[PDB]
């Protein structure tokens, strides 16, 4: 109990000291790693060409202002904190048709190296033609995810893997996944000096 | 008397949540009210239930005798830390059907029983037969491992005594059980409670 009490006091001191950063800039760019864990394709509406997915959106970034010496804090290596208390990236689907619905608490983990990891569960409707879904070749749809207001000079967006995580895809879903991939895309426009980055989520699926 | 409760509340009120050196046991149970709907075009089931949560904090205990023999009080669930227990396979944000108010007892126990409506992944195939459909939904902490939140079920089997007798679906059986999981990558135990329901057209 000396034990419980110290861990609590140490955590409170760590947090208090850490919460004493204006987002990324061209002179201070942020690398943001994005990945998806696809749980379910709930619905494909052929009357409006919208498809609804349930997924975890994994986000990882790193900030020098969130570094600490675990030794200075009773060997706390990490803590949990409400995502609303810290800055988060503005990664957004570019072709959604409804506001995203949040299915989970929104809580980040901050590590002593200043890594932040955030994994909200979400349901998203996006523009998608499900024609061919009832055939064996399946249908293919794609949605890009990117920063809303940050160019590739401020937010360098990438993945750890091109493979969307299907290990917990619902085994009795209406739809089975033929493939799910997440790919970095960089676009350069002649008007403009900045690179523009998105992660393109491409899902090939069919009726079970 | 009122004065004593105000002074107690004032005394008690910031808890930073469980840690590996201060782990928290959370007990979870379910009172199933009604399977409202089973949609086989999307494979979602809508379930209305009471979700019983209990946990205990050292920071919430007091001696009744220093406070006019108050043994407990009620408080808005927003006024205190509550655990991040979540359905891992919902397909919609959970809907809260009741006020969110806890009971805090002098030993530091907290009880919280919100009514909820949950849509979750479920194939209702066989619901029009005698054997029924079977569906399962996992609940667990969103961000705590078994080292910081020790999630368990209470003694009682699933409460079926308040299940709506004229529901479009009858419950053939319901179980609540804990699962402890270990991955080779990682040292932590990962805990989830499964609510398995077997149901059919009434």
């Amino acid at each position: 109990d000396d034990d419980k009490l110290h861990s609590q006091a140490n955590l409170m001191r760590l947090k208090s000291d850490l919460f004493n950063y204006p987002g990324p800039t061209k002179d201070d760019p942020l690398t943001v790693t994005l990945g998806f864990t696809l749980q379910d394709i709930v619905k494909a509406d052929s009357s409006t060409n919208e498809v609804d997915l349930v997924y975890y959106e994994q986000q990882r970034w790193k900030l020098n202002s969130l570094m600490w010496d675990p030794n200075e804090y009773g060997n706390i290596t990490d803590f949990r904190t409400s995502a609303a208390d810290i800055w988060t990236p503005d990664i957004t689907a570019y072709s959604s048709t409804r506001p995203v619905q949040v299915l989970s608490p929104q809580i980040a983990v901050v590590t002593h190296d200043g890594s932040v990891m955030f994994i909200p569960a979400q349901r998203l409707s996006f523009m998608c033609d499900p024609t061919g879904v009832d055939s064996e070749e399946g249908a293919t749809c794609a949605v890009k995810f990117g920063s809303w207001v940050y160019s590739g000079f401020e937010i360098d967006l990438k993945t750890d893997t091109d493979q969307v995580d299907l290990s917990s895809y619902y085994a009795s879903s209406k739809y089975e996944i033929l493939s799910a991939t997440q790919t970095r895309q960089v676009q350069h426009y002649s008007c403009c000096p900045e690179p523009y980055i998105d992660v393109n989520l491409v899902v090939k699926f069919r009726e079970r | 008397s009122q004065a004593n409760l105000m002074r107690l509340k004032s005394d008690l009120f910031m808890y930073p949540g469980p840690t590996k050196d201060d782990p928290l046991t959370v007990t979870l149970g379910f009172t199933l009210q009604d399977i409202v709907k089973a949609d086989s075009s999307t494979n979602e089931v809508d379930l209305v239930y009471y979700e019983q949560q209990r946990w205990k904090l050292n920071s919430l205990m007091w001696d009744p005798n220093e406070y006019g023999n108050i043994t407990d009080f009620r408080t808005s669930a927003a006024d205190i830390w509550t655990p991040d227990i979540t359905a891992y396979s919902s397909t919609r944000p959970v809907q809260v059907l009741s006020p969110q108010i806890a009971v805090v007892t002098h030993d530091g126990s907290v009880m919280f029983i919100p009514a909820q409506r949950l849509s979750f992944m479920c194939d209702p195939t066989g619901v029009d037969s005698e054997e029924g459909a079977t569906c399962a939904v996992k609940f667990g902490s969103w961000v705590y491992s078994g080292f910081e939140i020790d999630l368990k079920t209470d003694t009682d089997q699933v409460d079926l005594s308040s299940y709506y007798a004229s529901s479009k679906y009858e419950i053939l059986s319901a179980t609540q059980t804990r699962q402890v999981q270990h991955y080779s990558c990682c040292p932590e135990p990962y805990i989830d409670v499964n609510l398995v329901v077997k149901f059919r057209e009434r």
Partner: peptide, 13 residues
């Protein structure tokens, strides 16, 4: 896996 378990994923994925 660890990555489809939220409290594991948020830590090691």
């Amino acid at each position: 896996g660890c990555c489809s378990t939220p409290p594991c994923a948020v830590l090691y994925c």
